[PDB]
């Protein structure tokens, strides 16, 4: 039942995003786990800002 | 002195360009009306939350 950061794993990379709920969520791939789950962007911004920035930098468009 | 060497606290990114060959941000600094350019990679390290706020606003489907 623990989900996201409550699983106690290290974030590895963001592999999706959705704001359909009213808040921005990231699908987080965790280190040494096949099972990605959603986390609040607000939480990821604080706990792993460079992983967040990497997700944005790979999809820049002009 | 330019960019972060002005020693001002970053406040908001108000623009971006790649014309130097690397991504730069136009940084508006708090208590200064003179914005100027900083490397994105430097902003990533020094003010990641300001970088993220900029990107978050421009995320689009």
């Amino acid at each position: 039942k623990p989900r996201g950061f409550a699983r106690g794993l290290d974030p590895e990379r963001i592999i999706g995003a959705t704001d359909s709920s009213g808040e921005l969520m990231f699908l987080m791939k965790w280190k040494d786990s096949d099972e990605a789950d959603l986390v609040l962007a607000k939480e990821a911004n604080m706990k792993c800002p460079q992983i967040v920035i990497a997700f944005y930098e790979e999809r820049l468009t002009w | 002195p330019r960019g972060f060497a002005r020693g001002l606290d970053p406040e908001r990114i108000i623009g971006a360009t790649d014309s130097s060959g690397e991504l730069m941000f136009l940084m508006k600094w708090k208590d200064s009306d003179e914005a100027d350019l900083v490397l994105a990679k430097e902003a990533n390290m020094k003010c990641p939350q300001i970088v993220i706020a900029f990107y978050e606003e421009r995320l689009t489907w």
Partner: peptide
């Protein structure tokens, strides 16, 4: 079924 991007505009 769109892909998210960060949409920037070049200064000037």
């Amino acid at each position: 079924h769109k892909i998210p991007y960060v949409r920037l505009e070049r200064l000037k």
